[PDB]
Write a protein that binds this ligand. Structure first.
Ligand SMILES: [Mg+2]
Ligand SMILES: [Mg+2]
Ligand SMILES: [Mg+2]
Ligand SMILES: [Mg+2]
Lengths: 235, 240, 233, 212, 195, 231, 204, 244, 222
């Protein structure tokens, strides 16, 4: 056939470029970074009404100060999360401190290109890694299967990404509050989602310095959805 | 050692070996899971192309992983034994180190992790198996029902079916299963499970297997006559 | 873990104003047997470094080959091998020190005490010690084995601290070294009369002196000594 | 060394001395023999000081990884067994450890596990470990009741370390008190044995043998 | 640990095991249960070096429970005892052997017979009407040799066991803090809470 | 065509297409410039962003107090190769109490890249590196290609539109080599060189990345408002 | 401490006219403590008989091992193993543990099914074969057995006479050994019938 | 490199089938027919040797029926050499179990072990599967008399009567027609031989083209006897049942 | 038999001030009854405002310091030139030491610097990595001679206020850097008088927010 680690004539790794196509088919995940915190939101996208939606876990805790959202072949993310959690806890053991968000992200991204003929293929999932440390404050990173990670003020990944990113382009500014960011994720998720957005098919989360990483209750998110509807009807 | 990358991405972003593993599940006999208020019922199809079979010794479709958790499947039979064995070993290992039996979610997460591992390891193909894992957590009376598939994704279900003609029985369950009021008793839950299989099975004779799991390690498999009584009562109500 | 078989005794050395001096006798002892009388225990590396080795001779020959191999390796893909990128005393020492400590840490030591004497690129004197335990130290005077007990006291009377080094000439330093070698010949039962001496000067370079002998010895007073107490005849 | 821990109505009391010796030489009087594994779990340090520090800090890391993966507080049983299984792998190598793994969970209630470098793992109500353990046991056994108040229980643990600190040459310095509740442990201060002895002597009327 | 006794009567096996756990100078516990249920009708008591005892017992337990689930079937006491012997026989030539002695009391549901197996740390297995490990036999075997009958009732077995324990409490230098007694019969395993 | 399925296959004309495809990845990468005098050596790198919300990808990596590089192509491959350089620099210091020569650092990178071009299963590195450093023989600038070819130069540039900067340096050769004891003027020449490779976009405050090493100057990277001086 | 004398016990084998006899005591102990009076030390695989003295755990292990090996032998060869062949198998199996041996004293006895020739053999713990015509002895009272056998034995004894000779050799040897006794078993082996007899002896 | 020549033996087809397993089953369909019939008082194993010669030494020959232990036997359909590799592994497993538990291995446990080995070759290793289908005839004190079959996929099932090899469709129909639950060994012997006589591709069924075996409790009192029939004994049972 | 360990003598002393810290050590290096060097630096600046000394067997001491300095370097590479805090350095050193639990570095390690609140910090380690933040710690040959003196003169132990007669303790007033250096010098002068392995020279490293400063003093050379 052909090598797994083969370069195309354009100078790109076939398998990495193909894994990016799998991520495009994944459910939408959005992250927005502010000076009051970073918000992470996801589309759950249950394949049937009999599927208990609260068992869909696409937002995940890595440490108290680092959260993570995923999009694509979500099964692939489990070993990445396991490595991230181990890296975070191990660094605390060696250095009696929290690990920097960038350093955690870099550790995860080191796995990405460890494939060949090590694992047999790249990961088929993209990660939004959000967190806080004392050195660089609130941070949001986008970890790809290429091994590259970009820091973002706001980022959308998944099927509605380019449409959502264009919307994030206009809406984001440096003085956003946490509440404003929460509604903004809900607004953009509702726009790109096939089904109608509610507290059962969408999930919110955030990371603050005080309280750390928190996944939002369905009751808490429901109020923010109702708050969103009213403010859009307000003009 | 044999290191060949069998599971790989295609230009359209698909892993065909994982997708072809799902086609093996589609070929497998139908399996169904329905959870009531205080029980879970696992229904399984037995294709009647094979008679002269010895039903005493023939591998049963539902397997106990521990005294409180069970696993049924659709797809390659030989493949399922490997997942069942690994699960049973992990269940004992968990009891040995944590001094507490596995939760149904934990056991599911383990099996799903094994399945995932086989989709990006060299020299191996994915499992041609989807599983339904059901039971009750230790000292808990809330019913649990989970599904896994070759890719390694897993999730919780109020009711679910897998295997051949699973589209049809899922159609049935989606209109007949009410979340606000699930099958309150064992009878109601078994009845709904048998009804759902009768949409697909053919004859209601030895083609339907039923296993009822209740809290506190109370697992029992229904016999032919017990199931036949459900089959009789369902069709007599249908003649109207 | 081993035991030393064929052994070499003291290596002695000191700093002076423009460089360093190092000396060691030409004996390879086999226990109390003075087996080999033509053993060179000062091994020059380039034109700026002399490594003096005591202890097990088979390990000394191994170390000698490592240093020979080090010069070869340094010359590979190195247009400045005889100029800016030549081997320094400090490079040679650090390498040996690494090897010695690694070997002690595997419980299989090179059974030696080593003194690396030389002059650096900037003209600085280099004099540092390392042994089978990987223990290292530097001093205006350094000596191994018996030299530590008898040579150092004499050499320290010339250079007692860092500030005495610029005041000490090569003639005074060499005189002190040669006298110390005589004292060791009087008093060390595993020493020989024949020795080698090396001077590494920042101006005149490396001067290697072979086939030196202990001379001007005092023995005449022995004739008067009779008995062990009461005996007169 | 003297370390103790006992279960009671209000949870667990943990009490330890503060002395570290190398032979007759008193290396330190300000040594911490309670390892704060996490905000809910405590471990005591007797035998090898490094072995206890290192592996109980490591235990905290394992407990953190557990609750990240399982989304649930680790049981005292599971936490203690992670440590005992670990040291059992090292059995023969020369680890020196005698510890009480203490915690208070919903499913278990207040629980204490004595864990050993020989691989011993024992659940119990009262444990005392160290060179001054016998002295502390005496005060504990004669005064212990399940229905002790948190105030009286804290004093009993303090008084039992004092008993050992006085008689045992290799125990002393100061007393560190902890009270373990379901919502986490609560630190109850450092108490110098020198000042505590005279205070207790006068107020209690004990130690009449000693002139003060 | 210290004293473990076993006696096979007409229709059951009785295992008596001491409650004391001593770490050198102090008795750390006086209510320790030195036994593990391997299967519904098979009980194993144990004594030996600290740590090894419980580690071994739980390892065996896990393996028998694994077998029970895989085959949906309870192994016979004989089969369990042979498995245990092999593990110990494997262990004795290992880098660091399990220093553990065991008694396996089981009721064979197929044969409808109680069965007592004595196995030491070397893997020395013997089927006996009554057995012990360590010094326990030195004190008790003369009493058991005298009074024992194969047709004894469970109540008579307990009385003979009390006499053995009384002799131990009289002549043994160590205080083993009494014994926990368990009975293995056709109905399973139960503990005699007053002894 | 039929000879580009893996790195172990020569073409009929004696070409290694996988290596050439790896070389192509460098051309797609953002421009970076290297140049030196007798006292100092300077790296200038145009950082690339994904979009307006994103950060600008870092291009320069420190290997030791006296050595570092700038990258163009696959960033993860640069991380691997730079990590390897860090280790080799560190091995030299720990074992020989000796700072690693820049020329010897190039030889090590060449050999590491070479093994990936002659063996089955692996792939060439998909990145180009510009290594600067100051050692016992003064200032140095190297150009690394993942074919294995390492080249010592006065000045150079790699990445997209790098030919414009490379021609400029070829003209300015006699001027910038003489900029001794003046770090700011040497950087100016580097910023003016990289400007010849720009189209549409210009050098902004979070766009530009500069690094310098010299006689009494440890390898230090300048980003953000630290490079506003040179815009 | 000495592994070959912790558990105690003895085995003796003798040849007669168209017959062999093998016998053993029934004691298993923990040094001074008597533990079992039913510990038989003779086993058989088809028509080949094996006695094993020494460390009891190894006696049990080796029996299970030779059962294992003679069962596979039979399946592949389609015939029962012979005494001469089995003797070589025991030797090979012991020597493979040259520097970690089983602490045993095995004794093979049987009649070759094709030739009808009586056969006995003994081994040291490490596999060295002693193929004696007259008799083989093993165990903690081997000296006593050598003395008894050397005086009592005469060649070409009839089965029922051989029984008396081997029985008296075992019994009186065991009564001069603290770690042997507590019952005894004697096998009288002919080409196509084998009689097993439990002997009455002193129980101290 | 080497990838170019790799057949990839352990992959799914687009339909979700294992190519090599399916092609191995096609291979087995050309092998001589083997039949197993389970009765209340024993099991019968009957199998057809493939187009033999008059010069073949039949009395010492064995290509179909093999002994795993004293309680369990197998009938082979496919590559004989492949079967012997598996048979020897099965014989060892039975002995390992016997050594460990001091009890004869239960039939299903042995069958599961061999079937798991076959499964492994279909999921990992990149090797071709074993081109063999077994019929297991055996007895233990839990389930009594048991018939199983396994194929190259590693899937095994239990049976009252079953065939493997050539003409299994025709053979299974004939068995399904005449089999009854209260049947006895002597009746099962007749059914097996009658079924082979009708499904055979040969002109006539003779003793020299057959291998035959019975597992009976027809052993003196509570125990089981395996009987691998000799050429003369197969000739006698053919006359008794009225086929020749 | 080969003995992989040796004793190079020496004595070190760490004292934590209110907004400063000192780590002192003599410069004499010895084996048995011989002097190897009268000036062999024992206390090292490891970067990030941390000073370290690993006293005892000098080969293990040099090895540990070398590995820790290396750890500081790689901490910068791996974590964006982040400053290694004294508490983080301390935990890192524990793992370096415990890494060789079954073949230990035969040293008593002390580090000094400032914590993240700018206050003076000293950490003390045993050979196998058990450690603790301390206000005052002498290590090495004359540690037993120095520590009791420090208990008395730094922490005012057994000292009470005149007139009260044992009722009121002497208050624990903060010491200046000039006051600490006096106690350090007197500690080493006394240790030199009564311990044969102590002498030649005293080298003190003072850590403040401004950086690391060095002071050297002569000691008796007999
Ligand atoms: Mg563990
Ligand atoms: Mg025994
Ligand atoms: Mg006797
Ligand atoms: Mg007696």
């Amino acid at each position: 056939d052909r090598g797994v680690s083969t370069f195309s004539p354009e100078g790109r790794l076939f398998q990495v470029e193909y894994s990016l196509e799998a991520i495009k088919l994944g459910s939408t995940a959005i992250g927005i970074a502010t000076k009051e915190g970073v918000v992470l939101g996801v589309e759950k996208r249950a394949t049937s009404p009999l599927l208990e939606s609260d068992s869909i876990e696409k937002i995940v805790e890595i440490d108290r100060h680092i959260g993570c959202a995923m999009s694509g072949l979500t099964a692939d993310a489990r070993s990445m999360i396991e490595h991230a959690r181990t890296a975070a806890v191990t660094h605390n053991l060696y250095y009696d401190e929290d690990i920097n968000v960038e350093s955690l992200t870099q550790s995860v991204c080191d796995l990405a290109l460890r494939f060949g003929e090590l694992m047999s293929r790249p990961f088929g999932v993209a990660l939004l890694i959000a967190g806080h440390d004392a050195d660089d404050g609130y941070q949001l990173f986008h970890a790809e299967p290429s091994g590259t990670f970009y820091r973002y003020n706001a980022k959308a990944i998944g099927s509605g990404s380019e449409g959502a990113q264009a919307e994030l382009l206009n809406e984001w500014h440096s003085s956003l509050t946490l509440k404003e960011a929460e509604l903004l994720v809900l607004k953009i998720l509702k726009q790109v989602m096939e089904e109608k957005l509610d507290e059962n098919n969408a999930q919110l989360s955030c990371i603050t310095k005080q309280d750390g990483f928190k996944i939002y209750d369905n009751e808490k998110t429901a109020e923010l959805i109702k708050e969103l509807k009213e403010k859009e009807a307000a003009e | 050692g044999y290191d060949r990358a069998l599971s790989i991405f295609s230009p359209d972003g698909h892993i065909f070996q994982v997708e072809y593993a799902l086609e093996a599940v589609k070929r497998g006999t139908c399996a169904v899971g329905v959870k009531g208020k205080n029980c879970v019922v696992l229904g399984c199809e037995r294709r009647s192309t094979l008679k002269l079979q010895d039903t005493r010794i023939t591998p049963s479709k539902v397997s106990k992983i521990d005294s409180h958790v069970v696993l049924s499947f659709s797809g390659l039979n030989a493949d399922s034994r490997i997942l069942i064995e690994k699960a049973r070993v992990e269940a004992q290992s968990h009891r040995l180190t944590l001094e507490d039996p596995v939760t149904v979610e934990y056991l599911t997460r383990y099996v799903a992790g094994v399945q995932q591992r086989y989709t990006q390891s060299g020299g191996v193909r994915p499992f041609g198996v989807s599983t339904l894992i059901a039971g009750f957590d230790p000292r808990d009376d809330e019913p649990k029902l989970y599904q896994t598939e070759p890719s390694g994704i897993y999730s919780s279900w109020s009711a679910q079916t897998i295997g051949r003609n699973s589209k049809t029985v899922r159609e049935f369950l989606e209109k007949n299963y009410d979340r606000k009021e699930p099958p309150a008793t064992v009878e109601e839950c078994v009845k709904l499970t048998v009804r759902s299989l009768l949409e697909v099975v053919q004859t209601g004779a030895k083609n339907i297997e039923i296993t009822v799991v209740k809290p506190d390690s109370d697992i029992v498999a229904l016999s032919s006559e017990e199931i036949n009584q459900y089959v009789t009562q369902i069709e007599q109500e249908k003649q109207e | 873990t081993q035991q030393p078989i064929v052994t070499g005794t003291s290596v002695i050395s000191m700093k002076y104003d423009n460089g360093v001096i190092i000396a060691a006798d030409n004996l390879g002892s086999y226990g109390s047997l003075l087996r080999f009388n033509g053993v060179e225990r000062l091994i020059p590396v380039g034109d700026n470094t002399v490594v003096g080795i005591s202890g097990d001779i088979s390990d000394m020959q191994h170390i000698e080959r490592l240093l020979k191999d080090l010069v070869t390796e340094n010359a590979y893909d190195n247009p400045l091998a005889d100029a800016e990128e030549a081997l320094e005393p400090s490079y040679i020492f650090e390498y040996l020190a690494t090897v010695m400590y690694q070997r002690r840490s595997k419980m299989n030591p090179l059974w030696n005490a080593i003194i690396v004497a030389g002059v650096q690129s900037n003209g600085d004197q280099f004099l540092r010690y390392v042994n089978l335990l990987g223990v290292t130290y530097s001093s205006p005077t350094l000596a191994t084995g018996f030299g530590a007990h008898m040579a150092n006291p004499l050499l320290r009377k010339v250079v007692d601290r860092e500030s005495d080094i610029p005041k000490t000439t090569v003639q005074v330093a060499e005189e002190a070294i040669v006298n110390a070698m005589r004292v060791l010949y009087y008093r060390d039962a595993r020493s020989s009369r024949n020795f080698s001496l090396a001077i590494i000067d920042k101006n005149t370079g490396l001067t290697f002196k072979k086939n030196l002998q202990v001379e001007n010895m005092k023995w005449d007073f022995a004739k008067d000594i009779k008995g062990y107490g009461t005996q007169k005849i | 060394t003297t370390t103790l821990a006992f279960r009671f109505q209000g949870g667990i009391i943990v009490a330890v001395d503060s002395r570290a010796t190398a032979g007759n030489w008193v290396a330190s009087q300000t040594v911490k023999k309670v390892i704060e594994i996490n905000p809910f779990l405590l471990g005591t340090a007797a035998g090898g000081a490094a072995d206890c520090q290192f592996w109980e800090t490591w235990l905290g890391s394992q407990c953190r990884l557990h609750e990240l993966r399982e989304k649930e507080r680790i049981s005292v049983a599971a936490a203690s067994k992670i440590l005992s299984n670990l040291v059992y792998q090292y059995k023969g190598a020369g680890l020196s450890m005698g510890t009480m793994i203490c915690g208070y969970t919903r499913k278990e209630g207040p629980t204490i596990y004595y864990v050993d470098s020989d691989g011993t793992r024992l659940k119990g109500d009262i444990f005392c470990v160290g060179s001054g353990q016998t002295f502390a046991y005496g005060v504990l056994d004669s005064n212990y009741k399940w229905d002790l108040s948190v105030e009286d229980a804290l004093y009993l643990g303090k008084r039992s370390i004092l008993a050992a600190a006085h008689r045992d040459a290799y125990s002393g310095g100061s007393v560190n008190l902890y009270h373990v509740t379901e919502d986490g442990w609560i630190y109850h201060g450092n108490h110098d044995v020198g000042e505590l002895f005279w205070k207790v002597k006068e107020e209690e009327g004990s130690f009449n043998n000693v002139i003060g | 640990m210290d004293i473990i006794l076993g006696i096979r009567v007409q229709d059951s096996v009785i295992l008596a095991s001491s409650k004391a756990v001593t770490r050198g100078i102090s008795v750390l516990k006086d209510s320790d249960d030195k036994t593990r249920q391997l299967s519904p009708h098979t009980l194993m008591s144990f004594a030996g070096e600290a740590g090894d005892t419980v580690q071994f017992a739980e390892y065996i337990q896990a393996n028998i429970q694994l077998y029970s689930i895989r085959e949906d079937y309870e192994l016979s006491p004989q089969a369990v005892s042979s498995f245990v012997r092999q593990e110990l026989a494997k262990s004795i030539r290992s880098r660091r052997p399990y220093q553990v002695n065991v008694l396996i009391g089981g009721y064979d549901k197929k044969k409808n017979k109680p069965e007592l197996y004595q196995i030491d740390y070397l893997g020395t297995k013997v089927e006996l009407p009554y057995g012990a490990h360590g010094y326990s036999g030195f004190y008790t075997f003369s009493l058991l040799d005298h009074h024992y009958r194969p047709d004894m009732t469970t109540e008579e077995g307990l009385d003979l066991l009390k006499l053995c324990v009384q002799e131990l409490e009289k002549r043994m230098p160590m205080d083993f803090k009494g014994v926990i007694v368990k009975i293995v019969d056709k109905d399973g395993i139960r503990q005699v809470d007053d002894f | 065509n039929n000879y580009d399925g893996d790195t172990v296959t020569f073409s009929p004309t004696g070409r290694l297409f996988q290596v050439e495809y790896a070389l192509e990845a460098i051309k797609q990468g953002s421009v970076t410039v290297g140049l030196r005098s007798n006292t100092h050596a300077v790296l200038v790198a145009l950082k690339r962003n994904a979009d307006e919300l994103s950060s600008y990808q870092k291009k320069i990596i420190k290997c030791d107090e006296h050595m570092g590089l700038s990258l163009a192509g696959l960033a993860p491959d640069a991380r691997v190769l730079s990590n390897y350089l860090r280790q080799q620099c560190n091995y030299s210091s720990l074992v020989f109490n000796r700072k690693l020569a820049v020329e010897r650092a190039g030889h090590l990178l060449c050999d590491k890249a070479q093994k990936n071009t002659q063996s089955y299963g692996g792939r060439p590195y998909g990145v180009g590196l510009l290594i600067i450093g100051y050692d016992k023989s003064g200032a140095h600038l190297l150009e690394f290609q993942p074919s294995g070819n390492v080249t010592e130069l006065y000045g150079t540039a790699i990445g997209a539109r790098s030919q414009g900067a490379k021609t400029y340096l070829e003209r300015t050769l006699d001027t910038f080599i003489k900029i001794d004891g003046n770090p700011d003027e040497l950087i100016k020449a580097g910023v003016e060189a990289i400007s010849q490779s720009l189209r549409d976009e210009s050098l902004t405050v979070d766009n530009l990345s500069i690094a310098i090493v010299g006689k009494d100057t440890p390898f230090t990277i300048y980003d953000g408002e630290a490079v506003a001086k040179y815009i | 401490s000495d592994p070959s004398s912790i558990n105690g016990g003895i085995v003796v084998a003798m040849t007669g006219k168209d017959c062999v006899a093998i016998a053993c005591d029934l004691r298993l102990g923990s040094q001074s403590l008597g533990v079992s009076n039913k510990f038989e030390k003779i086993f058989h695989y088809g028509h080949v008989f094996l006695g094993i003295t020494g460390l009891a755990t190894d006696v049990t292990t080796l029996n299970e091992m030779f059962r294992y090996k003679t069962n596979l032998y039979k399946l592949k060869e389609e015939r029962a193993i012979e005494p001469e062949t089995f003797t070589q198998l025991v030797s090979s199996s012991l020597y493979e543990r040259r520097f970690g041996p089983y602490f045993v004293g095995p004794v093979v006895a049987g009649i070759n099914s094709k030739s009808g020739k009586p056969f006995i053999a003994g081994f040291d713990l490490i596999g060295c074969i002693d193929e004696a015509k007259d008799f083989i002895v093993s165990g903690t009272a081997s000296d006593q057995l050598f003395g008894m056998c050397e005086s009592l034995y005469e060649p070409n004894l009839e089965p029922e006479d051989l029984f008396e000779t081997i029985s008296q050799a075992l019994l009186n040897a065991a009564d001069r050994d603290a770690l042997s006794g507590w019952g005894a078993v004697v096998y009288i082996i002919k080409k196509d019938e084998v009689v097993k007899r439990y002997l009455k002896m002193r129980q101290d | 490199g080497s990838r170019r020549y790799d057949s990839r033996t352990t992959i799914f087809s687009p339909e979700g089938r294992l190519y090599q397993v399916e092609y191995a089953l096609e291979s087995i369909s050309h092998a001589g027919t083997a039949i197993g019939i389970m009765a209340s008082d024993g099991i019968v194993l009957a199998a057809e040797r493939k187009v033999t010669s008059t010069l073949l030494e039949q009395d010492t020959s064995t290509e179909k029926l093999y002994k795993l232990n004293d309680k369990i036997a197998v009938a082979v359909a496919g590559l004989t050499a492949d079967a012997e590799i598996l048979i020897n592994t099965a014989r060892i497993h039975a002995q390992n179990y016997l050594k460990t538990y001091n009890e004869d291995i239960p039939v299903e446990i042995l069958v599961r072990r061999l079937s798991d080995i076959k499964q492994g070759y279909t999921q990992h290793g990149g090797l071709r599967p074993f081109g063999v289908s077994f019929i297991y005839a055996g007895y233990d004190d839990r389930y009594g008399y048991q018939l199983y079959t396994s194929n190259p996929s590693g899937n095994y099932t239990g049976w009252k009567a079953i065939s493997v090899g050539a003409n299994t469709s025709a053979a299974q129909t004939l068995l399904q027609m005449d089999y009854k639950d209260d049947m006895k060994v002597d009746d099962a012997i007749e059914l097996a031989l009658k079924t082979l006589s009708k499904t055979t591709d040969s002109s006539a069924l003779t003793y020299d083209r057959l291998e035959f075996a019975t597992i009976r409790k027809g052993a003196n009192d509570g125990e089981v006897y395996q009987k691998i029939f000799k050429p003369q004994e197969i000739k006698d049972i053919l006359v008794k049942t009225g086929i020749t | 038999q080969f003995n992989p360990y040796g004793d190079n003598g020496g004595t070190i002393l760490g004292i934590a001030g209110e907004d400063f810290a000192v780590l002192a050590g003599d410069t004499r290096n010895i084996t048995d009854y011989s002097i190897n060097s009268r000036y062999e630096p024992k206390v090292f600046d490891c970067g990030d405002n941390i000073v370290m000394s690993a006293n005892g067997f000098a080969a293990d001491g040099d090895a540990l310091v070398k590995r820790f300095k290396n750890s500081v370097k790689w901490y910068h590479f791996d974590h964006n030139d982040k400053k290694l805090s004294i508490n983080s350095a301390a935990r890192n050193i524990q793992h370096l030491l415990y890494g060789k639990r079954f073949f230990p570095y035969y040293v008593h390690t002390i580090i000094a610097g400032l914590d993240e609140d700018g206050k003076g910090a000293v950490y003390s380690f045993d050979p196998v990595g058990s450690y603790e933040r301390e206000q005052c710690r002498a290590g090495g040959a004359a540690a037993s001679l120095i520590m009791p003196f420090l208990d008395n003169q730094v922490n005012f132990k057994n000292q009470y206020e005149p007139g009260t007669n044992g009722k009121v303790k002497k208050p624990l007033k903060y010491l200046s850097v000039e006051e600490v250096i006096k106690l350090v010098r007197d500690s080493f002068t006394s240790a030199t008088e009564r311990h044969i392995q102590v002498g030649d020279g005293l080298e003190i490293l003072i850590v403040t927010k401004d950086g690391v400063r060095k002071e050297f003093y002569e000691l008796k050379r007999d």
